[PDB]
Amino acid sequence: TELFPPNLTRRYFLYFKPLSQNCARRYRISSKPLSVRQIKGDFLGQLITVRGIITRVSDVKPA
Amino acid sequence: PDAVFGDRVRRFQEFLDTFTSYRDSVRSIQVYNSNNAANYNILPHRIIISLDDLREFDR
């Protein structure tokens, strides 16, 4: 007897989406478009957005 | 430790006068960094010890 590990029956994913609207100017940041240059500090293990230019597109492979 | 720790502690009472002029400095640099971070709507921990405060009276 072995129960299902929870990863078997999902057939779905999760996603997230931050904010940079006047709700940040309502009352209180985590979604200012910081560049790549100033990012090496305590920003490791967080949620940060960065703008850029996408290069080196690989293909789609099954994991 | 007593031999390798004793002149630590005797210095631990000694250099506290060698930041009479910096014990203001080390807290003034953070109190606004604590302030602005609470009202956003930034400096590292630099404690410049000069020679002069450690050569005039400790040999």
Swiss-Prot record, chain A:
Q: Where in the cell is it found?
A: Cytoplasm; Nucleus
Q: Which domain of life is it from?
A: Eukaryota
Kindly state the subunit structure of this protein. Component of the MCM2-7 complex. The complex forms a toroidal hexameric ring with the proposed subunit order MCM2-MCM6-MCM4-MCM7-MCM3-MCM5; loaded onto DNA, forms a head-head double hexamer. Interacts with CSM1 and MCM10.
Q: What does this protein do?
A: Acts as a component of the MCM2-7 complex (MCM complex) which is the putative replicative helicase essential for 'once per cell cycle' DNA replication initiation and elongation in eukaryotic cells. Core component of CDC45-MCM-GINS (CMG) helicase, the molecular machine that unwinds template DNA during replication, and around which the replisome is built.
Q: What else is known?
A: Present with 166 molecules/cell in log phase SD medium.
What protein family does this chain belong to? Belongs to the MCM family.
Protein name as catalogued: DNA replication licensing factor MCM7
Within the intact protein, the region shown is 189 to 254 of 845
From Swiss-Prot, chain B:
TM region(s), chain numbering? none
Query: What subcellular locations does the record give?
Result: Nucleus
Quaternary structure and interacting proteins, as annotated: Component of the MCM2-7 complex. The complex forms a toroidal hexameric ring with the proposed subunit order MCM2-MCM6-MCM4-MCM7-MCM3-MCM5; loaded onto DNA, forms a head-head double hexamer. Interacts with CSM1.
Q: What exactly does this protein do? A: Acts as a component of the MCM2-7 complex (MCM complex) which is the putative replicative helicase essential for 'once per cell cycle' DNA replication initiation and elongation in eukaryotic cells. The active ATPase sites in the MCM2-7 ring are formed through the interaction surfaces of two neighboring subunits such that a critical structure of a conserved arginine finger motif is provided in trans relative to the ATP-binding site of the Walker A box of the adjacent subunit. The six ATPase active sites, however, are likely to contribute differentially to the complex helicase activity.
**Family designation:** Belongs to the MCM family.
- Remaining remarks: Present with 35100 molecules/cell in log phase SD medium. Early fractionation of eukaryotic MCM proteins yielded a variety of dimeric, trimeric and tetrameric complexes with unclear biological significance. The MCM2-7 hexamer is the proposed physiological active complex.
Protein name listed in UniProt: DNA replication licensing factor MCM3
Write down the species. Answer: Saccharomyces cerevisiae (strain ATCC 204508 / S288c)
What does the record give as the organism's lineage? Answer: Eukaryota, Fungi, Dikarya, Ascomycota, Saccharomycotina
Q: Which gene encodes it?
A: MCM3
Q: Which residues of the full protein are shown?
A: 17 to 108 of 971
